[PDB]
Every structure is written in structure tokens, then in C-alpha cells.
Design an enzyme around this catalytic site. Structure first.
Site, PDB file in Angstrom:
ATOM      1  N   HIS A  85      43.908  54.102 -48.634  1.00  0.00           N
ATOM      2  CA  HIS A  85      43.185  53.459 -50.135  1.00  0.00           C
ATOM      3  C   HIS A  85      44.435  52.971 -51.013  1.00  0.00           C
ATOM      4  O   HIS A  85      46.013  52.947 -50.672  1.00  0.00           O
ATOM      5  CB  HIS A  85      42.419  54.597 -50.533  1.00  0.00           C
ATOM      6  CG  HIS A  85      42.653  55.863 -51.145  1.00  0.00           C
ATOM      7  ND1 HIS A  85      43.192  56.668 -50.382  1.00  0.00           N
ATOM      8  CD2 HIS A  85      43.145  56.174 -52.524  1.00  0.00           C
ATOM      9  CE1 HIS A  85      43.588  57.849 -51.138  1.00  0.00           C
ATOM     10  NE2 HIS A  85      43.667  57.274 -52.509  1.00  0.00           N
ATOM     11  N   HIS A  87      45.736  53.916 -53.993  1.00  0.00           N
ATOM     12  CA  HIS A  87      46.698  54.630 -54.547  1.00  0.00           C
ATOM     13  C   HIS A  87      48.028  54.833 -54.410  1.00  0.00           C
ATOM     14  O   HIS A  87      48.268  54.565 -53.248  1.00  0.00           O
ATOM     15  CB  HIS A  87      46.095  56.182 -54.760  1.00  0.00           C
ATOM     16  CG  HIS A  87      44.527  56.109 -55.513  1.00  0.00           C
ATOM     17  ND1 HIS A  87      43.682  57.238 -55.344  1.00  0.00           N
ATOM     18  CD2 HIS A  87      44.142  55.517 -56.573  1.00  0.00           C
ATOM     19  CE1 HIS A  87      42.781  57.099 -56.083  1.00  0.00           C
ATOM     20  NE2 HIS A  87      42.968  56.123 -56.955  1.00  0.00           N
ATOM     21  N   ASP A  89      49.932  57.187 -53.867  1.00  0.00           N
ATOM     22  CA  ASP A  89      50.374  58.457 -52.749  1.00  0.00           C
ATOM     23  C   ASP A  89      49.915  57.619 -51.543  1.00  0.00           C
ATOM     24  O   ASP A  89      50.454  58.311 -50.594  1.00  0.00           O
ATOM     25  CB  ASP A  89      49.435  59.671 -52.958  1.00  0.00           C
ATOM     26  CG  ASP A  89      48.002  59.739 -52.960  1.00  0.00           C
ATOM     27  OD1 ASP A  89      47.413  58.490 -53.319  1.00  0.00           O
ATOM     28  OD2 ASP A  89      47.387  60.393 -52.536  1.00  0.00           O
ATOM     29  N   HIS A 150      36.112  58.884 -52.594  1.00  0.00           N
ATOM     30  CA  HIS A 150      37.348  59.091 -53.489  1.00  0.00           C
ATOM     31  C   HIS A 150      37.560  57.649 -54.064  1.00  0.00           C
ATOM     32  O   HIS A 150      38.031  57.641 -55.055  1.00  0.00           O
ATOM     33  CB  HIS A 150      38.432  59.746 -52.703  1.00  0.00           C
ATOM     34  CG  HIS A 150      39.734  59.787 -53.440  1.00  0.00           C
ATOM     35  ND1 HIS A 150      40.117  60.693 -54.363  1.00  0.00           N
ATOM     36  CD2 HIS A 150      40.923  58.964 -53.161  1.00  0.00           C
ATOM     37  CE1 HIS A 150      41.224  60.435 -54.785  1.00  0.00           C
ATOM     38  NE2 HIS A 150      41.831  59.107 -54.010  1.00  0.00           N
ATOM     39  N   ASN A 181      40.687  63.421 -59.072  1.00  0.00           N
ATOM     40  CA  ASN A 181      40.679  62.113 -59.892  1.00  0.00           C
ATOM     41  C   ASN A 181      39.257  61.511 -59.485  1.00  0.00           C
ATOM     42  O   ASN A 181      39.267  61.463 -58.217  1.00  0.00           O
ATOM     43  CB  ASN A 181      41.690  61.184 -59.682  1.00  0.00           C
ATOM     44  CG  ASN A 181      43.052  62.132 -60.135  1.00  0.00           C
ATOM     45  OD1 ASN A 181      43.897  62.586 -59.478  1.00  0.00           O
ATOM     46  ND2 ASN A 181      43.229  61.912 -61.539  1.00  0.00           N
TER      47      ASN A 181
HETATM   48  O1  LIG Z   1      42.542  62.969 -57.073  1.00  0.00           O
HETATM   49  C1  LIG Z   1      42.661  63.370 -55.908  1.00  0.00           C
HETATM   50  O2  LIG Z   1      41.691  63.572 -54.923  1.00  0.00           O
HETATM   51  C2  LIG Z   1      43.878  64.198 -55.493  1.00  0.00           C
HETATM   52  C3  LIG Z   1      43.648  65.722 -55.132  1.00  0.00           C
HETATM   53  S1  LIG Z   1      43.888  66.360 -56.603  1.00  0.00           S
HETATM   54  C4  LIG Z   1      44.443  65.394 -57.493  1.00  0.00           C
HETATM   55  C5  LIG Z   1      46.147  65.862 -58.072  1.00  0.00           C
HETATM   56  S2  LIG Z   1      47.073  65.402 -56.517  1.00  0.00           S
HETATM   57  C6  LIG Z   1      46.513  63.950 -56.154  1.00  0.00           C
HETATM   58  C7  LIG Z   1      47.116  62.737 -56.885  1.00  0.00           C
HETATM   59  S3  LIG Z   1      45.951  61.282 -56.707  1.00  0.00           S
HETATM   60  N1  LIG Z   1      45.073  64.273 -56.546  1.00  0.00           N
HETATM   61  O1  LIG Z   2      47.904  55.555 -58.035  1.00  0.00           O
HETATM   62  C1  LIG Z   2      46.857  55.010 -58.469  1.00  0.00           C
HETATM   63  O2  LIG Z   2      46.465  53.967 -58.351  1.00  0.00           O
HETATM   64  C2  LIG Z   2      45.896  55.552 -59.639  1.00  0.00           C
HETATM   65  C3  LIG Z   2      46.405  55.280 -61.061  1.00  0.00           C
HETATM   66  S1  LIG Z   2      45.895  56.458 -62.077  1.00  0.00           S
HETATM   67  C4  LIG Z   2      45.827  57.696 -60.985  1.00  0.00           C
HETATM   68  C5  LIG Z   2      44.484  58.065 -60.573  1.00  0.00           C
HETATM   69  S2  LIG Z   2      44.605  58.801 -58.726  1.00  0.00           S
HETATM   70  C6  LIG Z   2      46.083  58.002 -58.105  1.00  0.00           C
HETATM   71  C7  LIG Z   2      47.261  58.832 -58.273  1.00  0.00           C
HETATM   72  S3  LIG Z   2      47.109  59.619 -56.747  1.00  0.00           S
HETATM   73  N1  LIG Z   2      46.201  57.128 -59.640  1.00  0.00           N
HETATM   74 ZN   LIG Z   3      43.644  58.539 -54.011  1.00  0.00          ZN
HETATM   75 ZN   LIG Z   4      45.541  61.193 -52.489  1.00  0.00          ZN
END
Ligand SMILES: O=C(O)[C@@H]1CS[C@H]2CS[C@H](CS)N21
Ligand SMILES: O=C(O)[C@@H]1CS[C@H]2CS[C@H](CS)N21
Ligand SMILES: [Zn+2]
Ligand SMILES: [Zn+2]
Length: 230
Positions: A85, A87, A89, A150, A181
Site C-alpha cells: 500500500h 504508506h 512504511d 487498512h 491509524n
Molecule cells: O496504522 C497502523 O495499522 C500501524 C500499526 S500501529 C501504527 C503505529 S506503527 C504503524 C505506522 S503506519 N501503525
Molecule cells: O505514510 C503515510 O502515507 C501516512 C501519512 S500520515 C501517517 C498515517 S499511516 C502512515 C504511517 S505508517 N502515514
Molecule cells: Zn499503512
Molecule cells: Zn504499516
């Protein structure tokens, strides 16, 4: 299991590998988010004498460390990567992958959403994944779009050789009891998307969440419980 690397064991900037099965590993990294440090998983799958990478290690520096650890521990080239996806990460580090000679892939939806967010954008578009229930083979894995969960673009990955289901961030680890999130989520659809995952992969033996410890198919019911309790 007591064998899987945990968040406190991995300083930000280091990457661990965990061998799941013959030619199947997870990668584990850590990153600062919301004033804390969290772990994050991806996957590595052998394809002959090459490797397929699933997801970055959550940033440029971590992804460079991931490539170094792969070269050190496995010694086979990463030729393609798929982001599951949009994000950071999952795509943060795509530019590093490109500079290392890796061909990067994601769905049209993921590519669009990454662009809108100002995240890094996987180069190549995956075909055949536009509607819930769509599945395509990609080298040694199957890619499946279960519907919105998600995020609206989230994919899951199955490794048939080992019955490994990589749920990505649509699946929560057992110890997580509250939603993460949700600004990108479809909480109304998420339980149904999980039903579609189980219907497609009912014999999965190992289930890897996007963050935290692996489990079994019990993680699907657990995630539904969390999403509906929220
Ligand atoms: O939004 C989520 O599902 C996940 C798991 S808990 C939350 C904190 S770590 C990671 C960053 S996107 N995150
Ligand atoms: O990386 C992203 O696109 C967004 C922006 S705000 C934040 C919410 S979940 C993810 C972190 S894992 N994130
Ligand atoms: Zn994510
Ligand atoms: Zn993630």
C-alpha cells in the site's frame, strides 16, 4: 514463539531477517512515529537465483540497511519489489531501491495515493488487481486485492510453496487490542475484506502482520474483533 525479533531489540537504522521457510524470510525494521518507535515487517521470497522483495523497510536509511543485510545473509540479488500500500512504511525507500537496480511495482491505486501523499512512487504498475477478489501471480507469489481495509489499496501476498500469508497492514498482531491509524481505512468494509482473504487462502499456515509478531489464521478473526470494537 519467542524467536521473532521485537521492537526493543532493533535500533532505528538496523534491519533483521527472520527465516520463515525455504526461500522465505521476513524483514524487520523500526522507525519513529508519533513520538514512539514501532517495528515493521516486510517479506523476501526467492525466485530461482533472484529475490523478490515485498515492501521497503520504512525509509531510505533503513532500506539501504535492508539491502546490505540481504547481501550479507542471503547473497542473491533483489531484482523486483512490490509495495502493498501507499504508506511510508511500504514505499519509503523506493528511491533507494531504484538506485540499487531494483524494479519497483505497485497497483495503479497505490501509485496514485503515494503521489497524492507526497510519498515515493513505485515505478511500474501491477495489472489485474483493480477489483475486490482479484488475484494475479507475480513470480513466486500470488498477489490478492481483498478490498478496502487498512487502506483502500491494500494488497496481501501468498507464498504457495510454504503456505505463508503476508497480510501486511490489513492484519493486526495478536497483542494489538485497539485500532492503529484509520484516516485511510474503511472500517465498515474491513471485516468483509478479511472474509475474502480467508476465503481465498483458507489453508494458510503462517500469517504475517504488517507490524509485530507472526501468527496463524487466528490473526484474521482477531483483526476483525479489533476493527469492530473500535
Ligand atoms: O496504522 C497502523 O495499522 C500501524 C500499526 S500501529 C501504527 C503505529 S506503527 C504503524 C505506522 S503506519 N501503525
Ligand atoms: O505514510 C503515510 O502515507 C501516512 C501519512 S500520515 C501517517 C498515517 S499511516 C502512515 C504511517 S505508517 N502515514
Ligand atoms: Zn499503512
Ligand atoms: Zn504499516
Amino acid at each position: 514463539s519467542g524467536e521473532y525479533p521485537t521492537v526493543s531489540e532493533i535500533p532505528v537504522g538496523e534491519v533483521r531477517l527472520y527465516q520463515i521457510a525455504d526461500g522465505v524470510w521476513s524483514h524487520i525494521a523500526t522507525q519513529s512515529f508519533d513520538g514512539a518507535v514501532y517495528p515493521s515487517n516486510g517479506l523476501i521470497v526467492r525466485d530461482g537465483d533472484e529475490l523478490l522483495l515485498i515492501d521497503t523497510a520504512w525509509g531510505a536509511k533503513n532500506t539501504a540497511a535492508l539491502l546490505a543485510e540481504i547481501e550479507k545473509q542471503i547473497g542473491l540479488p533483489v531484482t523486483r519489489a512490490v509495495s502493498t500500500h501507499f504508506h511510508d512504511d511500504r514505499v519509503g525507500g523506493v528511491d533507494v531501491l531504484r538506485a540499487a537496480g531494483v524494479a519497483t511495482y505497485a497497483s495503479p491505486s497505490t501509485r496514485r495515493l503515494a503521489e497524492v501523499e507526497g510519498n515515493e512512487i513505485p515505478t511500474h504498475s501491477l495489472e489485474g488487481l483493480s477489483s475486490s477478489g482479484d488475484a494475479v501471480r507475480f513470480g513466486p507469489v500470488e498477489l490478492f486485492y481483498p478490498g478496502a481495509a487498512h487502506s483502500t489499496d491494500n494488497l496481501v501476498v501468498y507464498v504457495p510453496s510454504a503456505s505463508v500469508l503476508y497480510g501486511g497492514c490489513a492484519i493486526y498482531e495478536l497483542s494489538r487490542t485497539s485500532a492503529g491509524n484509520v484516516a485511510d481505512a474503511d472500517l465498515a468494509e474491513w471485516p468483509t475484506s478479511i472474509e475474502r482473504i480467508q476465503q481465498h487462502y483458507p489453508e494458510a499456515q503462517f500469517v504475517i502482520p504488517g507490524h509485530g509478531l507472526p501468527g496463524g489464521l487466528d490473526l484474521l478473526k482477531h483483526t476483525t474483533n479489533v476493527v469492530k470494537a473500535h
